[PDB]
């Protein structure tokens, strides 16, 4: 029921 | 919201500095990206992800989250995933992703 986005891309 | 308007709008905003734009416009650009992702066949999403990683200098360890965004925008219904992105991601992440996508979207084969 809740929609969860993936973690945002990590720029090094 | 025609094919022609979509492409012209993407061309215009691909070339803008969006670092300081208004939230309402940033939100509309996210919608633009979602609509444009759905102009790619499922078969091209892996290529879209790879091209995004290359353009952005991102490691292969970031492949999974980038691909998930493209996949879930592609399958989105009622803007639920899109709305989650807007809510749960920080502004800088949204900006980086949107600019990346708008700059690759028109250059890649869509089928």
Outline of the structure:
The complex is a heterodimer of chains A (about 10) and B (about 110). In chain A, about 0% of the residues lie in helices and about 0% in strands. The PDB classes it as viral protein.
Write the layout of secondary structure elements.
The complex is a heterodimer of chains A (12) and B (111).
Chain A: no helix or strand
Chain B: H1 3-14, H2 23-37, H3 45-56, H4 63-74, H5 80-88, H6 91-105
Organism (chain A): Zaire ebolavirus
Protein name (chain A): Nucleoprotein
Family (chain A): Belongs to the filoviruses nucleoprotein family.
Describe this structure in words.
- Helices cover 0% and strands 0% of the residues of chain A.
- Chain A has no helices and no strands.
- With 12 residues, chain A is low in regular secondary structure.
- By secondary structure, chain B is an all-alpha fold.
- Chain B has one domain: Four Helix Bundle (Hemerythrin (Met), subunit A) (Up-down Bundle).
- Chain B has six helices and no strands.
- In chain B, helix 3 crosses helix 4.
- Chains A and B meet through loops of A and helix 4, helix 5 and helix 6 of B.
